[PDB]
Amino acid sequence: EFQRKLYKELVKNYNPLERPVANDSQPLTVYFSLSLLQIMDVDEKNQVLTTNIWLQMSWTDHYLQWNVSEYPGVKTVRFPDGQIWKPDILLYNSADERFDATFHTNVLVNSSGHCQYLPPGIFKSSCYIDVRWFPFDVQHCKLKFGSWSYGGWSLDLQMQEADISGYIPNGEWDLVGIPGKRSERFYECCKEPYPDVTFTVTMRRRTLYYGLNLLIPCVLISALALLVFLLPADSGEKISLGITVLLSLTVFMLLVAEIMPATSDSVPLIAQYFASTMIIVGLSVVVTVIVLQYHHHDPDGGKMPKWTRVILLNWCAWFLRMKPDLAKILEEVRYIANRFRCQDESEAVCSEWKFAACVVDRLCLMAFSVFTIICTIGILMSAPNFVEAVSKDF
Amino acid sequence: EFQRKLYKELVKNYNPLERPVANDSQPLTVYFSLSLLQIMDVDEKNQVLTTNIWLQMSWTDHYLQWNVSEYPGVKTVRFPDGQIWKPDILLYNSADERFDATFHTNVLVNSSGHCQYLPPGIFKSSCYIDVRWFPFDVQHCKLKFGSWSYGGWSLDLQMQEADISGYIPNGEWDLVGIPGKRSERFYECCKEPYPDVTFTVTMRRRTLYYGLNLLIPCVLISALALLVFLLPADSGEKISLGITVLLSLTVFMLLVAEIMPATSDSVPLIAQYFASTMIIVGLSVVVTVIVLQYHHHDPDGGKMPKWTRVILLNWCAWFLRMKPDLAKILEEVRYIANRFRCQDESEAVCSEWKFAACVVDRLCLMAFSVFTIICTIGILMSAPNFVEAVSKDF
Amino acid sequence: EFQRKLYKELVKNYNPLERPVANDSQPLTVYFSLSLLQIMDVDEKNQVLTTNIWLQMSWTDHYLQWNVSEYPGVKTVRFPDGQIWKPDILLYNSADERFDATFHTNVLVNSSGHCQYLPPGIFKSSCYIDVRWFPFDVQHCKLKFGSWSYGGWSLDLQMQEADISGYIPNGEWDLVGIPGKRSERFYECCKEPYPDVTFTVTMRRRTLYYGLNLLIPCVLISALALLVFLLPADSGEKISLGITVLLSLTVFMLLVAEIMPATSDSVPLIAQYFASTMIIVGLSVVVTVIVLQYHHHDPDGGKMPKWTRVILLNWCAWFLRMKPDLAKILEEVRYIANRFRCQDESEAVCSEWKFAACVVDRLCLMAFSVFTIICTIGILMSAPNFVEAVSKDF
Amino acid sequence: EFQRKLYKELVKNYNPLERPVANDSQPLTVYFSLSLLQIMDVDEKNQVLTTNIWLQMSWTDHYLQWNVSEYPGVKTVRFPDGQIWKPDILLYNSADERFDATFHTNVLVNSSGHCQYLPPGIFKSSCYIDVRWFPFDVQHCKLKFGSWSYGGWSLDLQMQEADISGYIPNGEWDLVGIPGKRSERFYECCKEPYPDVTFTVTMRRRTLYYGLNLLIPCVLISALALLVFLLPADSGEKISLGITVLLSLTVFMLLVAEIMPATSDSVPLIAQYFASTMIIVGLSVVVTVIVLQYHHHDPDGGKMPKWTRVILLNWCAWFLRMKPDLAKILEEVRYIANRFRCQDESEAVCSEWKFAACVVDRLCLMAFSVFTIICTIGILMSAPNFVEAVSKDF
Amino acid sequence: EFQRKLYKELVKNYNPLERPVANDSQPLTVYFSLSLLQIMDVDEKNQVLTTNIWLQMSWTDHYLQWNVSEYPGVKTVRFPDGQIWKPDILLYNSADERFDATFHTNVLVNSSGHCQYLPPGIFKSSCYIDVRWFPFDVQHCKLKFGSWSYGGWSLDLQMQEADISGYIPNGEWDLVGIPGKRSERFYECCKEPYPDVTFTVTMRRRTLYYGLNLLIPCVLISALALLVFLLPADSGEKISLGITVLLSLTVFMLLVAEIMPATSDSVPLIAQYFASTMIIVGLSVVVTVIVLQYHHHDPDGGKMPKWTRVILLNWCAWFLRMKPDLAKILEEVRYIANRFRCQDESEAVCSEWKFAACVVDRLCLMAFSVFTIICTIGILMSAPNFVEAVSKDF
Ligand SMILES: Clc1ccc([C@H]2C[C@@H]3CC[C@H]2N3)cn1
Ligand SMILES: [Ca+2]
Ligand SMILES: [Ca+2]
Ligand SMILES: [Ca+2]
Numbered sequence A, B, C, D, E: 001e002f003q004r005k006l007y008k009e010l011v012k013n014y015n016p017l018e019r020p021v022a023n024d025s026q027p028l029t030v031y032f033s034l035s036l037l038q039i040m041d042v043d044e045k046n047q048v049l050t051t052n053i054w055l056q057m058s059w060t061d062h063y064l065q066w067n068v069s070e071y072p073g074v075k076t077v078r079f080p081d082g083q084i085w086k087p088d089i090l091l092y093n094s095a096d097e098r099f100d101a102t103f104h105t106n107v108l109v110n111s112s113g114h115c116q117y118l119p120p121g122i123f124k125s126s127c128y129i130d131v132r133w134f135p136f137d138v139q140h141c142k143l144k145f146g147s148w149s150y151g152g153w154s155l156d157l158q159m160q161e162a163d164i165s166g167y168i169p170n171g172e173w174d175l176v177g178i179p180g181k182r183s184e185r186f187y188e189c190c191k192e193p194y195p196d197v198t199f200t201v202t203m204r205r206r207t208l209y210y211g212l213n214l215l216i217p218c219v220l221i222s223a224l225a226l227l228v229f230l231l232p233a234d235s236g237e238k239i240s241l242g243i244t245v246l247l248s249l250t251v252f253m254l255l256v257a258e259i260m261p262a263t264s265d266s267v268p269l270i271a272q273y274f275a276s277t278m279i280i281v282g283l284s285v286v287v288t289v290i291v292l293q294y295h296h297h298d299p300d301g302g303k304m305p306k307w308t309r310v311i312l313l314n315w316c317a318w319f320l321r322m323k324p325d326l327a328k329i330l331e332e333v334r335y336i337a338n339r340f341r342c343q344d345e346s347e348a349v350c351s352e353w354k355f356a357a358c359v360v361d362r363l364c365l366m367a368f369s370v371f372t373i374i375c376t377i378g379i380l381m382s383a384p385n386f387v388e389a390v391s392k393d394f
């Protein structure tokens, strides 16, 4: 009875085109906020953030009021899209192909005329995703909301703090906060300033996954390249080991290239460490070629330089703690015996060149091991969030 | 005649905005349930569950009633979307881009005014998919349903057990059950509690596919790395075999990385076993390098330590059950003969170093075989659902 | 004149909510069928069939009738969606995200009131796609159609044979038939049985493509592994050939894993043959390691067992059709000459071990060739549709 | 004034359900054509063509006419969707998920009642894409248009030649023409023939891209396999070169398999040439194994057949232009000297076997080079459009 | 009061079909522009540009005017889609599947009747993306806007300069400008010219990303192939190094093939440099085979040509700065000693052939290094935007 009577009366002469103020010269205060249920997807490559959000819009509708004693039991009424005036608040920085992704629900109105409009939606929004420190990165994705076609003279947009009471944690992203800011900007279209309310979703990436799936595997696989320095030259597999490990590491940059936007704004930290590793492994192959030249050095070819004999076999080697008819028969056997002496003399020259190769391996083992260690630590610890990350995620 | 007359009468003064209760002060009981036809897709990476569901909503509409003796043969009437009041029940944790994925169908109303609304739909819902025990994992995906804009004072949502009579099994997922729970929660928007009905779809993954396509192939491919310990050093292919098998195993983690969400909440069991295998294969390469140093040990280089001569050639080897002018001609032939004696003396030193290499291979074969076996069993059997899985799926 | 007059008269008091029967107590016969234009996509991984279909619905509308002599030249009238009653027939097992994929077109009505409604659409439907015999598989995808909200008491759904006169063949799938079946089932929602009409699209896969792109390439690539048995051990490339071929075959299972659903219902035949091939190639590597141990056997190491000397060098080898100062100088030259005799004695031992390696290669060549042949034939011919496929597709 | 007056008058008693003919017994002539702006995507795998098209529909509306002297300045009026009758022309062979992809725009009507309806749209259409001659292929994609629910008795569909004045060339596809054909077919639904207008978009693929990205790279990479015949056996890298090149060529068929539909209707020319190349490279590996058996032939093993000594070392080799105490000391030195003579005798046998290996390499180099050349030319020149393609694209 | 009164009066007799001019014979001036917020995605493969744009349409509506002194405080009114006439301006070269991607918002009208319509949208547009100079490319994507169904006689479309005040930079693309051009073209449909306003979005690609991820990695990986010339032949890994590096470089063209459209209009610069690199690396393998023939040259085989002895061992080598019973015993030892002399004579021949191999390596090292350098510089510097790019991006 009363519900039926109220609805009929409330729509009488109601025009949803009309901004529901008793005084047209005054603006309409609209309180705006949102509830952040969950961060669904942070697309780095396309620079889009996906969130499950419940917008929260409240205002007073001067015409939607009644005395509850004349309609007992009817404390609230509901109105669907198009039958009541509502604010045209949109996400400016939407990435959604239909632009407005909100699911229109009922506006809930109480007898004093206070309206509650809480449309849910899956929102896609453009977010400059800074990849400089990936995987130890923190993002600040803006969500700018404002009335599209009412400026500050007609619609006084006001902010209320975001609700995260129902926030469900992501797994990849720790929510740091969703602070909000209400600004009043002018646009080149119009002479009226249009207020907006922007919420900044601050997110720390949780680093365990990429620590285990990219960083640590690259460390361990690249160190396998350093075993080339311990592998004997006579194995005939130094180059196969080195070049095979090097080209396998390309998978990691391919994986990174599948996550990262193709931008020139910064060079991601992960890329810097992967580039350093492949350069170090590539130089290990370069050094390996030198070691093989020494190992295989032709004994009749050019003699070992004095510098080589001292810088490698003396100094570096010490530091590393390495260190009638009888006459004819006589001349024939002399030849055979002297022939062996030359062979053995050439053997000793070869041995020194092979010893030089071993010493070069040993110095390069220590040098590439130490150089691998410092470049890795230095690159990873240059991230401001590294210490926080290691403490929180590991 | 009568159908035409009834429809005309039933819409007379009917307002679909009105909650159809004879007494406005009382809430409207709405019975909610669903029928689960099939689980279409469990997207682990995006944490979304896709289901084919028929929602089941029933309530009484006080105004949609008639006396069947005055409209003979008209036992039921149907009303499409927008012409009758219906509950605004939505899936809260929807992942769908249009949020509400239900296909609006007719509400079926009988002469007593009992309404049946059974909209089908393909529903996408956010589901925390726990990957800790993958592939031996069990998921519990919630489907939370509630009236969006009517709270408990106006709409008394009540639960009925889910219907699985038409459930078509998936192939990848065994349905354990779809129990339901009706809660009464308060929200930071409002002072009215909003009832909800949540159904939890419990699903056991069937493990045969990933058992055959990931786990078993990795076991068999990694064991091929253990053949390096049986391969003779003189083959000159120990490193090629080991490093080639190791880098091939990366395909499996790449496959896993194509299924798993990039989260830091847990480390999947499959990842733990794959990580253990590659570490074991990687260490086999490391050991292989040592075996080659022994095999190729320079005989003039450092003598074999007493520890090496005993720990390998004595103890471990036993356990493994291995074990004028004539004077000038004389001095020339003496040199040639003594030269051979030194060569043979150096040969025996080489042989001992090569024997040491063989013993190290043999110990490492037994050690890496046993270590491969226990790590594999221990990791796989740490899954609570392993014994159930093996019994049910294999 | 007459068209304008008829349309006006026909809509007078017409209520599209009304089921158009002259007698409300009787059900309305609705003839249902479809025309199958083409099979667009059979998605095995997602278990969805995509078809281009023209539904065919016919019924009589008691109110949409006129005497053609009073409206000369107006033999038919058309009505778009929402202005005439039509059956609410839906595809139950739809996979489409909007569930109902039909494109609403006009209902064509003639002066006797017979209605023709032939909406086209691209339909997505859930189909249990049995992969047990892939690529020699035959599918039976059901398309279940029924009135969503009218049961058998109100709507007498009747079947007519599917039209394939306009069927355009697919290229991958031979259409076997689209038989139809009309059932009368009860549901747990309701006490009225709801009739349905299900058409079963039977499809034979054409096997040439996967025969040429998966099966035959795997046969030919795997046979290249058998050349290891003909490759001499001294080449030092036996392991590189075997392991390289083995790991290349993984591409094929990766390709298969990109087509197959991740289900545990069956193990596809293609997977069984690929698994057999890799196991055979993997065992060839295992045998290759043994052959290298024989080839490289240390002559001073353990003597050849009597079993080895007979089972390989005698029986299997036959079957394969293989088969003062002068005294000092004397003792010095004696040593040199006796030294050569021991070297030659050890050479003969080595030769026997190398001959044993060659015989093992030869037996394994014949054994792995024969074993490859039978496993391949046996697996492929275990498919019931193999003989049909080879005759029809090759 | 006049625009406002005309619109009011024109809608008075207008029924958009009515086919706008002054005489209902006559059919309505509808002129149909289209403008082809651009070919957006030719999806070979899914057999769908995507085009940007402006449909062109014209007809006369008997009711939408006025005298321009009574409405001065109003020479035309526009009507949006649903307010005027228009033809229900659809694309029969649509691949679009919503089936009808046209963007409804205004119908432009002039004072004589001539209507112009030119809706744009992005159209997806099913096209049998014949892959037999890919990349030198020419396609003929049909676009069949017709009134869905008006047959020839009511709607006289007439064709006008397609407009390509605004055609923007594709880059991958040369447009040959878009001829049109008007047919009159009967359907199994109805007794009225339904006219249709089909346009056939003929397209020649431009071959430069696939010439440079698939064909030529495969030629050059496969020829690298032929260097195995020039590589000395003693390098110990013949098998690594051959098998490594062979397995790298699989990338190309993988790329092709990512473009081609999985159909059994034909075998693409590109596939035939790739299959020929891998078979030739695979046989080169097979021959390489034989060459290594000769190179490594055991000298004590079976003697070289007379056929081998003549067919290789004589004929083929010529064609290729290759070609007391002193007695004891005596017997001891005799042994040492005779021992060397046997070694040298065995050396000469080895040399002949190694020479045989070199000759086999040389014949196979010339044979595989010539065989590679003819198979490549013969396969590529079997395409009817090859000569056209090479002239136009290269 | 006044807002309610104004809205009622303004809609009285208003017909949104009517073009709002006081004089129908005159055209309606519509000012068109846009605001470019951000370039979202430049899809090279599909030739589609995605932009976030706010269209700006302004015109005067003769009927939507009032005297503000009679409606105090009501300075503006808003009207949603379908209740007011607006221009039907569309993007002609749209790539969007629904063609018109604009999100319809309110038209803002002030008391003088000036209308502001600023619909936002995510626009997809076809853009010929010229890949000739990629990654150093500059694109000019047209955005053609015009009234679909009003020609110049009725609608006088006028341009205003694009607004980039809110432009957010992309990261991959530097915005050069968005100049606009208003044209007046005739179409084959009609006799009225249809004005249009086209904006050309000029974009320079920022090259750092592809410089670091494609160009530089290819340079550094390919140079590793040049180490084959420094690797000794006796290593037995020259071919493994060369062919392994060569086939790894295929990844880069695969990456490029994943970005580039499959067009034959041009050959991208990146492809030209990648093709040059692989040809150079491939020729290095070809040369490596020659070096191995020299290294392994049979000493008894054909003597070294005079040309070889001079062009390599003399000229090129200099430039590179390389450089009773006793009689029987006598004849036996003579044989042994003469046997060694022949061995040593053959050794010297071998050494010269090995020296020739070393010289060929050295010339080829210098030749391939220099040839790699010039081809790389020459190809990269042939891009007109190279110098700009290096200065701006590096
Ligand atoms: Cl009709 C109209 C007037 C103004 C506007 C604009 C002003 C601010 C900035 C974009 C949008 N909101 C949008 N529509
Ligand atoms: Ca992320
Ligand atoms: Ca799953
Ligand atoms: Ca298929």
Ligand SMILES: [Ca+2]
Residues within 6 Å of the ligand: D041, D042, D043, D044, D172
């Ligand atoms: Ca194409």
Ligand SMILES: [Ca+2]
Residues within 6 Å of the ligand: E041, E042, E043, E044, E172
């Ligand atoms: Ca781009």
